Design a protein around this nucleic acid. Structure first.
Ligand code: K
Ligand code: K
Ligand code: K
Ligand code: K
Ligand code: K
Ligand code: K
Ligand code: K
Ligand code: K
Ligand code: K
Ligand code: K
Ligand code: K
Ligand code: MG
Ligand code: MG
Ligand code: MG
Ligand code: MG
Ligand code: MG
Ligand code: MG
Ligand code: MG
Ligand code: MG
Ligand code: MG
Ligand code: MG
Ligand code: MG
Ligand code: MG
Ligand code: MG
Ligand code: MG
Ligand code: MG
Ligand code: MG
Ligand code: MG
Ligand code: MG
Ligand code: MG
Ligand code: MG
Ligand code: MG
Ligand code: MG
Ligand code: MG
Ligand code: MG
Ligand code: MG
Ligand code: MG
Ligand code: MG
Ligand code: MG
Ligand code: MG
Ligand code: MG
Ligand code: MG
Ligand code: MG
Ligand code: MG
Ligand code: MG
Ligand code: MG
Ligand code: MG
Ligand code: MG
Ligand code: MG
Ligand code: MG
Ligand code: MG
Ligand code: MG
Ligand code: MG
Ligand code: MG
Ligand code: MG
Ligand code: MG
Ligand code: MG
Ligand code: MG
Ligand code: MG
Ligand code: MG
Ligand code: MG
Ligand code: MG
Ligand code: MG
Ligand code: NA
Ligand code: NA
Ligand code: NA
Ligand code: NA
Ligand code: NA
Ligand code: NA
Ligand code: NA
Ligand code: NA
Ligand code: NA
Ligand code: NA
Ligand code: NA
Ligand code: NA
Ligand code: NA
Ligand code: NA
Ligand code: NA
Ligand code: NA
Length: 254
RNA sequence: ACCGGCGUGGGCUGCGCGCGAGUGUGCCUGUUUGGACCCGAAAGGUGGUGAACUAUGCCUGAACAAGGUGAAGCCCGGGGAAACCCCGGUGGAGGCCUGUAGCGAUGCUGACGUGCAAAUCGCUCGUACGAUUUGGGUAUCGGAGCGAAAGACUCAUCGAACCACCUAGUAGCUGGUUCACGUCGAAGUUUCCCUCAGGAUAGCUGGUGCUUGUUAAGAAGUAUUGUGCGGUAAAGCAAAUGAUUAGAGGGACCUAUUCUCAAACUUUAAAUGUGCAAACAACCCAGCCUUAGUUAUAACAAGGCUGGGUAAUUGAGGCACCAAGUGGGCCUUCUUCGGUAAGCGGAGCAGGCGAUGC
RNA sequence: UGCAGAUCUUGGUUGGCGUAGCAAAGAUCUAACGGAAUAUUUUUAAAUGCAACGUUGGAUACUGGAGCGGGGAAGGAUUUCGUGCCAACGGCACUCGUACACGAGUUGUUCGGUCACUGAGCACAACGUUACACCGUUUUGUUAGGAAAG
RNA sequence: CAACUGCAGACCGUACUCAUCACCGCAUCAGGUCCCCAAGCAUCGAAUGCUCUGGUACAUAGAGAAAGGUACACUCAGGGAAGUCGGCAAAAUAGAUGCGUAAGUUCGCAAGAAGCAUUGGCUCUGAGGGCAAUUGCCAACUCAGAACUGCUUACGGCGGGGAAUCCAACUGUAUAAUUAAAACAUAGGUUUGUGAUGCAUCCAAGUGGUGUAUGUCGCAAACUGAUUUCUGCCCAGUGCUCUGAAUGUCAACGUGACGAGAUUCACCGACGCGCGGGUAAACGGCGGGAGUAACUAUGACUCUCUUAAGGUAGCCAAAUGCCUCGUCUUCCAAUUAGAGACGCGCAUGAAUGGAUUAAUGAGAUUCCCUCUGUCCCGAGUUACUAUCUAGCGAAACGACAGUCAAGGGAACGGACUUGAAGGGCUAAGCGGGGAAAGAAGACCCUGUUGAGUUUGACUCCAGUCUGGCUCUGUGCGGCGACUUACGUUGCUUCACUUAUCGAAUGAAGAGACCAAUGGUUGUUUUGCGCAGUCUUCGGGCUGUGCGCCGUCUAGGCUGACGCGUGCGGAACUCUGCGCCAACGGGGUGGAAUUCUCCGGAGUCUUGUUUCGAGACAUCUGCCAGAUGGGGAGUUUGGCUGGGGCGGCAUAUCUGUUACACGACAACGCAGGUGUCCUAAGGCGAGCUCAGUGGGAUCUCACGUGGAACACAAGCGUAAAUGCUUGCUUGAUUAACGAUUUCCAGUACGAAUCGAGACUGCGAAAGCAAGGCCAGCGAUCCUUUGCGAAGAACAGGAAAUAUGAACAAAUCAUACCAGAGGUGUCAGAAUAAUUACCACAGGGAUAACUGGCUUGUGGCGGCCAAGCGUUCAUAGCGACGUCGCUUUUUGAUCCUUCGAUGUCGGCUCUUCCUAACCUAGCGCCGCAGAAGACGCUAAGGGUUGGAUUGUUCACCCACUGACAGGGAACGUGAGCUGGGUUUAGACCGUCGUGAGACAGGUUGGUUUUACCCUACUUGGCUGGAGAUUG
RNA sequence: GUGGAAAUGCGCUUGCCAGGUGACCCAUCCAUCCUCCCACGGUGAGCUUUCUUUUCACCAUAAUCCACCUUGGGCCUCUCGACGCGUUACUCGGAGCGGGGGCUCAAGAUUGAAAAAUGCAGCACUGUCUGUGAGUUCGGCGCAUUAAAGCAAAAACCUGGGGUGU
């Protein structure tokens, strides 16, 4: 047979992201001496839209700690951020929306976004529209903080990791029904080459494990093993259960 | 060399010996390998060249007559206690409608069908502000790429492109195979084979002979005489086994009969057949020899030595070596099995055609 | 080392046969001139030199501005111009020609490009891998365990 | 620095074209090819028609009413779909204005729904504005109205409409060159994996690559397919999964034993499997049989079998129903069609989605109005051809040729036999034959040929998971295990950091100074005691004490200094200021401020850029196990009245076929065989069986086998070859003895006659090395038995041989005799599918024509029991028997596989008779009328429609009548293309799957005549020895 | 350096830093240049059997520069508003509407230099024009509308903050 489409995407030839009109990665400030001992003050100058992303971004302007020049940064904006607002980043910063603080200085039960998983990662968790994390507890003996992730899982991080205060802007996006195939065309024009989608039963046996037959059907169970080789791993991968969920659903993930 | 059993025993085995026949070379024929008498696959492998056709993404440019309908927002009048509800304008939305250019290709199953054309032409037809059309640049390819998915397309080449090479690939299968005369001249049958369109093996044929003979040596698809073998035709059921009709004499039963039968019944039993013999490497008689065989021993067995006497009519007997083609058959007489039958299928004996005219 | 056939190979010849045809895009006529292409007869004038070509004037007509108009890119590369010429070629014709022959023609401080920008992207150096560089990385501010500023 | 002035301004391109002749299509080819400029009138106008400027008369022409054609050309009386598979094609509607507009609906639409009226020309009137001082002057065509007058309904351009059923929600895409669709996509719905040392995944490989410039409102992987209303039961099977490893089983690595060692054994040993849970919007599945209610009929009710569960809500002869043209209503004169109903439904049914749906559709189907040359039934006209001429000028094909009838023949002759025609050359047509041309048949079969695809085929490879070793270091504790309680050791707990791994940063400020279960051999000279124990006599090691390394500090408390806290700290308070290349101060030296250092700006480094994890990872390498159509390679018997399914005629035994020696075939007939038996083998003795009759199991007589002998059958046997009984192991060994059957005079199996040893039973002669003939197996490999102990001064008639430099003990190997098996039985290791298909061939072999046959089909004779009011025969005629035909279907396999175009209809000619009508006769159960039967007769005739692709059939009508057949099942270079029978797609059933179905459904290129003959017309010209004598 | 109360006007050099131009292409409406009609006039040809103060053609001004009334937008000042201003159109105003007077940007208009010395038509010389209406993407409304669709980048150039110089 021929190579399956799932394996062809790993070459990434015509399936890479469309990033010509993007603005760059959206990161926090670099963790330096000033943010570990005091605070830095910056001004929000612009709030802008990036194709392919649902959350608006903010351009913040700081002063260089050591040189006579100005530094411009690009971050994911929390809700309520406005142009002209003052941003404070550091250990000695107060607790307000849009400020960046170490996780150990934020009171339990507070809503945060742009959380660092490692000290210096510059933000990796809760970055999509309307998403946030919750601070559960602190442990001063070991210096670890426990959070609740948007997916429902719980994760422990060092207390020196930084986070923003508030929720990510642009929430409520998926509540509006797309109505036309034309609207889905423009949604994926900024992301990548992945739409429209052809069903596997509608292909031929040379292309997909589900192809062929005088009727359109799968002749074998769709649940496949975790050990299946590439080209065989299609369907529902390593599923613990199938069918309609009745009652409370367990937390997804490992 | 391998043994058995208690001496000048015994019985198996060798591509053994038994007064050598080999060896070198020339030439022809057969067996085998190689391109292998000549030409022919669908395939398989290695290394390269293509996205000018066409598929999809991206960068930067260009284009889309004339009409219909009339969404939000806005203005002014009315009604109402409130909540709010009505008329008229304005405005110009939509993967909206009619319709050019553009982009396509439904029907005539029209024209042409050695064409204008290796897919074109004429009317008619779909859509025509959008998931729209298009130039240049750029990015992803052959056990691969790409695909709103048709096994679509990747330079007239795709259920796996093109170029060169391995490669004169293999073919139990199809086609071909070039002078004359002369001497002979078949087979389609047996056994074994993943064998059934092919082989090996025996038979039929040719060549080369060897040993001999001149009336017959170990002669004969034929008779005679003598002496063996047989259960088919016929016959039988008043005889065994099986089937079966009806009366008679003592409803069954018994006795003697009676009609009608048999590839897998038989007392009897042909014709046509089929073994053997009818002499010289033999027989008959006489006198002897030997033995570890037989017999209680004259007598038998077996191998020898020395002298006497001995069924027509046709005619060459015996023995090797090497090799070819063939291994689809068909018809008729008589005897036959299956089938309603067949210019049907399957056998026995003989003669034919094939191979042959007159 | 001998050929009659292998849908055999390469040349040549052949009936069919002066046959099938040369039918989309409407179309030409007239006088004078040119030309070897005439007004060609010795055996009144018509019934014995037909048919066809170019230029100019006149007539008639088509394209009908999404044009058989006037300029460019890709591609072509002397097809451009003048003079001459009619063997072969323009599936009829030619005195015509993008044909043949001989000579000519393309002029920039300002026009287009380079000088002198970045884009989708490419891949020298350096490093790593590979039996073998003819391999990989090389724009998310950006090469290289990295001393790359003259 | 702004003016002016002087001088100098490099390189390459530049002609022409951009297309009905300059480019790509073999060409000056009706195909294709990007950009700019774009006039007047009609008109809504870049529609369409005509014209000024610019550009062109270039595409072979002349003459000219044959047939038949093509057309971007028309018209037809009366009827109006009667045509056809089907209204295909044509006709038809049409602009604008005023009025008017239904069911249904997601309230947007449907809608231009449907339908009605007006429209020319001419002469007038009104309304709709601007600027200057009520006046004056001036511009744009739109709309409304009136009088008069006219029509031959009169350019171009420009929707036909309505009522329903099926499918898909819609716009869109899509097999370039036969399929545009119901297929794909879509919005909506559901499920799965996953928190980055992640999930999916590329590469031969690395500090390599993609989703990821990302972060659960994300990314990756599936299924269904708008909205509305719903989505039932089943976890037994297969799959997936579990935070159950609890126990059984297992590989390397490890740990111990016997042995001299190779070897051998024991223990330990992970995931997985097993066991036990979960899961169907995972693959999938979702029952039978009796009885029963006041006429019958049905059965709410009962009983009984049985599943993992027994089809729920819905829907239906539906694109799914075989029977089937189901049954009822409606639509027509008539309906295998359509709609509405009914439902034990071969074989409907719920995200393998069920039901319903407005709007939309070059989708499939039925009816109605309008309209028509589709038809009754054809006729006339135009332009270009064909036809004749001038110029120019091919191809395909071509054994040789070209009149028929019958015969036989390879079973359909141009050539052959017999007969009958035949005059030379010829122009325009035509499509009967040349089984005409085009292509080494694509259907079917065969070959020890392939390829694409699948999986529970055979043999394997990546990937994933798991164990061991290595990478790999330092300490503190526990549980064991082994050696006399101290030494090694395997598991582990905890604390570390330097190997290693992850991340960030332009390696941009780590830690301490706050002081120890720190070090103190130190950049330029810092060590000092005590105790114990060693010494090479110089001084060390261990444990303890004191010094030194070694030290500053914003702020906040306490009484300008000390002492606790603090740990590098001076920052204005929901919305946008500047901030840089040092001021000052201390010294050194030179002067009246110039150079240097030190602070401003805290010191130090047993040293790591900083964080996280950390001796583990799954970090590197090497071994080991499991899983693994993701991938690679290969295979997937034979015979056969084609092949397949079936069967075994594939190795074998009896009777018969079989024709009186022997041999003899069929998917011929009737039956067997792969076993069974320490006795059912061997021998001696005694006895007589099956059955019958007479007497109360017992007794007597008869009894040729009519019983028995393991089994199939045949043969054989009576003081026995049978039965009972006693003793036994001849079912052992048997020096390579010979032979028969099959047969090649090979093997294997079976069997016969013997020689030797030791025996059994018999008083002996004698019988017995299985049970009589069917009951079984090569090479290579594996495995067992025999070559016991001694004797020999030497390998001998007597001691098995070898391991090749020689010796001791193991081990391996040879020679002889058996066993483990090949049933395809003279003996490869083996699953499917192809309609996407390929190649070499086969008329050795099927599907269509033809040929033989005639069971079956059809059509008739002979006899006469009966029926016919009595009466065999007016008319019929059973039980029997004799034929004919080739118009049915079978049987066969002769011709054709380098191809003979395969159903039906349309058109047209001809032949037959077994006679429906028309002609002439006879007879009747023939009064008249109307009919039955029979004979001679084939001259003439035999219809229009509804449903269906049909042939056939069945209805409605007319008629004198609406007969049956043949001609290659007449007729495709005559047509048409509805059916059948490729590739697309949907349903039902079947299959794990790819796929299958002579089940249903929808869409799907019909090529060439100019040659010979035949036929139809059209002309020229010879010929009497049918050219000569 | 300097003028004005203000909007802002007129006449030495940049190690470093910060802005701007480049730079983002619109239905509708208005609109330059341009071409197309009309009205008046000049010049030259055409028809004339009969009519036609008639039919046809032409009537042109390149770049560059000087001086300084219309339209649209931004702003200053005085008087300080609740109803008021304004578009075909979906607006706006004590965070400052409207009115008087001004500063400024963009697109046009007008006078002049160039330039009649040129060009055109007729025969050496003659003539050598303006005003209306319709169409048309330069420019303007930093424009409406879908948007889970919402600014390509850089060289080069311009100005300022500081500093230097006078
Ligand atoms: K939000
Ligand atoms: K042979
Ligand atoms: K309607
Ligand atoms: K279509
Ligand atoms: K979906
Ligand atoms: K289950
Ligand atoms: K299960
Ligand atoms: K359609
Ligand atoms: K013909
Ligand atoms: K014996
Ligand atoms: K073999
Ligand atoms: Mg990228
Ligand atoms: Mg498909
Ligand atoms: Mg597969
Ligand atoms: Mg389906
Ligand atoms: Mg070859
Ligand atoms: Mg192979
Ligand atoms: Mg439309
Ligand atoms: Mg056609
Ligand atoms: Mg297919
Ligand atoms: Mg041959
Ligand atoms: Mg002879
Ligand atoms: Mg022969
Ligand atoms: Mg020759
Ligand atoms: Mg001709
Ligand atoms: Mg014209
Ligand atoms: Mg043009
Ligand atoms: Mg010519
Ligand atoms: Mg052009
Ligand atoms: Mg052309
Ligand atoms: Mg008009
Ligand atoms: Mg027009
Ligand atoms: Mg036009
Ligand atoms: Mg008519
Ligand atoms: Mg009809
Ligand atoms: Mg039609
Ligand atoms: Mg209504
Ligand atoms: Mg209407
Ligand atoms: Mg559709
Ligand atoms: Mg097609
Ligand atoms: Mg088509
Ligand atoms: Mg039904
Ligand atoms: Mg149906
Ligand atoms: Mg009908
Ligand atoms: Mg129905
Ligand atoms: Mg369900
Ligand atoms: Mg179903
Ligand atoms: Mg459509
Ligand atoms: Mg004949
Ligand atoms: Mg002719
Ligand atoms: Mg063939
Ligand atoms: Mg074979
Ligand atoms: Mg495979
Ligand atoms: Mg077979
Ligand atoms: Mg036996
Ligand atoms: Mg045959
Ligand atoms: Mg043919
Ligand atoms: Mg034919
Ligand atoms: Mg024909
Ligand atoms: Mg199934
Ligand atoms: Mg007020
Ligand atoms: Mg007030
Ligand atoms: Mg003002
Ligand atoms: Na499938
Ligand atoms: Na399905
Ligand atoms: Na050869
Ligand atoms: Na060869
Ligand atoms: Na074999
Ligand atoms: Na053959
Ligand atoms: Na043969
Ligand atoms: Na780049
Ligand atoms: Na559309
Ligand atoms: Na679909
Ligand atoms: Na039901
Ligand atoms: Na029906
Ligand atoms: Na013809
Ligand atoms: Na065999
Ligand atoms: Na018959
Ligand atoms: Na019959």
């Amino acid at each position: 047979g021929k190579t399956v489409l799932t394996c062809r995407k790993g070459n990434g030839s015509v399936y890479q992201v469309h990033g010509h009109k993007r603005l760059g990665p959206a990161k926090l400030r670099i963790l330096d001496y000033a943010e570990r001992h005091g605070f830095m003050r910056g001004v929000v100058k612009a709030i802008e839209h990036e194709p392919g992303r649902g959350a608006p971004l903010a351009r913040v302007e700081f002063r260089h700690p050591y040189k006579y020049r100005r530094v411009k940064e690009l971050m994911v904006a929390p809700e309520g951020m406005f142009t002209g607002q003052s941003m404070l980043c550091g250990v000695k910063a107060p607790l307000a929306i849009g400020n960046v603080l170490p996780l150990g200085q934020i009171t339990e039960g507070c809503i945060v976004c742009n959380v660092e998983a490692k000290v210096g990662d510059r933000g990796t968790l809760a970055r999509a529209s309307g998403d946030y994390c919750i601070i559960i507890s602190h442990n001063t003996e070991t210096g670890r903080t426990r959070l609740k992730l948007p997916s429902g899982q719980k994760k422990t991080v060092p207390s020196s990791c930084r986070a923003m205060i508030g929720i990510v802007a642009g929430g409520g996006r998926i509540e509006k029904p797309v109505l036309k195939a034309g609207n889905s065309f423009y949604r994926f024009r900024g992301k990548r080459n992945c739409w429209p989608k052809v069903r596997g039963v509608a292909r031929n046996p040379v292309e997909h494990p589900h192809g062929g037959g005088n009727h359109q059907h799968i002749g074998h169970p769709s649940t496949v093993s975790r050990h299946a080789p590439p080209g065989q791993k299609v369907g529902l991968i390593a599923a613990r259960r199938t069918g309609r969920i009745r009652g409370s659903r367990a937390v997804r993930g490992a």
